[PDB]
Amino acid sequence: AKSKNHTAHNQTRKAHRNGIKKPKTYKYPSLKGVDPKFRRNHKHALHGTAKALAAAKK
Amino acid sequence: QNPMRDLKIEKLVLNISVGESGDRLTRASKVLEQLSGQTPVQSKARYTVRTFGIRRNEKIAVHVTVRGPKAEEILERGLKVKEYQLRDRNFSATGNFGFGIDEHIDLGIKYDPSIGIFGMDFYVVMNRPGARVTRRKRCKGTVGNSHKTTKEDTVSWFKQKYDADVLDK
Amino acid sequence: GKSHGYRSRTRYMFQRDFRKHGAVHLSTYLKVYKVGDIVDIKANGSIQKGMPHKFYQGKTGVVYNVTKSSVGVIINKMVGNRYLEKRLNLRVEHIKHSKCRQEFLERVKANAAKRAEAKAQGVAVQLKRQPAQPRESRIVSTEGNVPQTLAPVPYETFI
Amino acid sequence: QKDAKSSAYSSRFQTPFRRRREGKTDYYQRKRLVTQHKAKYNTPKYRLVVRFTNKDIICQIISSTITGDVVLAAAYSHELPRYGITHGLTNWAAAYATGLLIARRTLQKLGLDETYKGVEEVEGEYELTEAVEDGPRPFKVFLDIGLQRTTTGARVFGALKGASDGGLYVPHSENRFPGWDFETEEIDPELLRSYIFGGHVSQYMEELADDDEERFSELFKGYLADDIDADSLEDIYTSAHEAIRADPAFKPTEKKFTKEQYAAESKKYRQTKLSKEERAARVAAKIAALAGQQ
Amino acid sequence: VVEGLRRARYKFPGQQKIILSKKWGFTNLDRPEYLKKREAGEVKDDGAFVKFLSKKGSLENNIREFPEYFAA
RNA sequence: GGUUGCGGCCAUAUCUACCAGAAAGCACCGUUUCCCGUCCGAUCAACUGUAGUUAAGCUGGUAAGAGCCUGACCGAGUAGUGUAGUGGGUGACCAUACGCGAAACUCAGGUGCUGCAAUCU
RNA sequence: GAGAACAGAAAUCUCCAGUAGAACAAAAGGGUAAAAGCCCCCUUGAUUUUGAUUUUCAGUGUGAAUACAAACCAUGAAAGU
RNA sequence: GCUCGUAUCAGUUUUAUGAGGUAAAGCGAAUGAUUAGAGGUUCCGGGGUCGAAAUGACCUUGACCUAUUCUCAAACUUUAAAUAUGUAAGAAGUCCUUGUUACUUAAUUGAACGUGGACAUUUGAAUGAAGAGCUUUUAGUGGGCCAUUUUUGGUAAGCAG
User: Fold this and answer.
1) Which residues carry this modification: N6,N6,N6-trimethyllysine (chain B)?
2) Which residues of E touch C157 (CB under 8 A)?
3) Does the distance separating the beta carbons of C65 and A34 come in below 8 Å?
């Protein structure tokens, strides 16, 4: 009692019903996976930038 | 047109190949060292063949390389032993040559009964200035056709020096 | 049994080249990639560390991370009915900049130049690109170019 | 003909890089030296390239770009005699002097001359150019010897030590200086100082004068002509060192001539290419004479 | 030879045609072209096939070969 | 324009044969006391550039050169290929319509360019 | 290919040619020539911590791992690895 | 259902820029297969005629170059399509102030983020958009089959894949 093993029939149609729309993009992407040295530096630089901006517009 | 194209002895390799290793091999290395004035290098086996009774890495041979006036004088001894009779077939097509002798005592070595009788072959490699050019690390090169050695030129040189002729055939 | 390895069916794809074997020229190491740069992936068969997968061979992505000898590239890969963001740690030998992005940046600079020129005098710059318009009317001469009449040739074996 | 290479062989032959087949550069170590940490985006990687030919010492400070390597500072043993070492322009002491000259030259050029003065009371001790607190870091350059064999007591490491003493921060270890012992892992400062100030050459001159006057008169001819001896050579080495520390500015020459006349002379003495029409005439004459029987 | 090829066609499957080639024998040159080259000297016979002279190459090698074309 | 050092593109740069090379810029050497390494100062290391050749590494030039690059309304709109027909044909396959479009062949040209620094009748 | 007494088709030595036609544990395919092959020297990074990532994937797990980070080391003159 | 009015879009094209080794083609280009000569064969091999002397002669196998020549390759290839396929076509953008940093640089050198300023009905191709986007929850399904093309095993099958 053998049966059909595999097929890609109807798969593209099923995908394209409500499918291949592009993923949504963001400003300020996640900083995970980037160099942790750069992460520490960016954290300190952002803190300093916020402090300086508050000082500039008190 | 011959400023530096004159031939000069590059080196003389003194080679013996013993069918077996052990006492024969070390005593033959010893006599070669005593004849050459320097320690020789032992050559192992490249593969295994049953007829010659050899196996891989067996230290089959011993040879040495001598250059300069000592090479020249050892050559003079070799030609004296060989009666200064050489062959065109003996001479190679690249300009180098050589020949083999037996009973090394003929060269003028004091017979030690321990070492016994041991033959050996001399091979003379010959060229002109430019060996540094051909085998220096930086900017490797090859000498030109005119600067390259050849059989007729080397037989002419070998006759003119020592006035030792070669038989026609 | 079936075989689906990491480098399966990559014979000719990762085949190095014809008469381009051996060491790689140092321009590739001299190129500089920053975060946000669009880069093309073409795996080098002679370099085995940092090699991308055969799927990402020939794809284009955005640099999101920079490291000692590598670069983080973001590729949108179609998985089923959607694209997922895959992050690759590729090497500078396998990675290469995008001439398309360079051309677009050059066009942006040019476009700004023409807009500045328009602000200078306003000569209807028409910033946007237009497709291949149909060719307008033209008059072609026959002096020295009298039409040579052609006819279909009879069949011949030609063997 | 046995000496006939196949058309297929010549077609499938892949020639190496031009410098590789000229035997000038090792692209392995060149990649290892030029490849820069990608997190340091456009930071140049500076190599102190040292090159040795008899009659010439070349020391250059080079960074690498896509269009080619660019030279920052250069010092030459052929202009060393202007600073005061006339003979032995390719020895260990001359290499040290050239390294000192290039180090001082680039420090003056880039503004790190006052800071990182180097060593003035040179004795031969192994030390690196440490960074000064509350100031700029020392100029970091990596040694480049090309195909020259790295070994103990080499003039390449003489130039290395010369630059390190001049003030360039060159990362290095002392186990290659003349005076480092294999059995006892300690460098001999006195031996290194002698090599720096020409102690080996002075020793050779003294022993030749003691034993063999024939060779001592056949060569060392410049020293005999200019009345130079064992102590005077150390004196002139020190004077050259202080003169280098004083004026490393690299005053150039006007070349006493002009590139236009140089080019004109070289062109008139050079050989000229043959035109396509001339080649066609040559083959026509060849078929007329060799082939056409006149 | 046409009849012999017809018999071979009978032996063979499918459909075959018999064509009177306009080239000279087993060469790839039409009969006028071979005739003109052979009255000239770019054509010289080997044991079975024929050797052809090239406008490019080593002139002395062609001259030690192809002597008739140059000296004719 | 020659040359050297560092190179970029990596044969228009390679390979075979031959001829030429003023002046500068590696040479056999004098050498092995020292550093260093080998059976062998041949390689590598080192000190003198001093008696000395263009040897010839190197460069340039020449071959109806091999190779390698660049083109073509040469091959050839051919092989192949996407789309269409209730097109042909027993079929194998083939033609047409709307498009895309090779390679090998055949000719023609070329035989390194260039960056930084230094130096040279 | 040429040459050297035994030594010859095959023993060791020496030149010349040699785009790899060799070798790299294995099966095949890639890859590698001042090396990724052969030899020599040192050595344990085949170490610790827990993250991120690729491949089959449901973007689950197992198997390998690409790039880092914080340490401690090896090697090399050093760049680096 | 939720947040939102001509939207961060697209089973499409164009422009620009990547990747491919399939069709084709090629084997006087590599590997493997394969037909036929001819030329020179003297570094071992076979017999015949000069016939008691070796590299003193010829015909063969051919220790072997061509002007070579006929055919080929799913697990061969220099070359190499068509159809498919990855990106980009901007305001989350482009240019002066480097303001912050414990990262980085020899260095206020770079890296990242940002404050001040300039850019409108061609805000940077075409076409369309029937409202973009987003979340929860759950049914049935998880035996498929048949054209036209590509294609595997098989003689073939209304065969199997």
Assistant:
1) 70
2) 19-22
3) yes
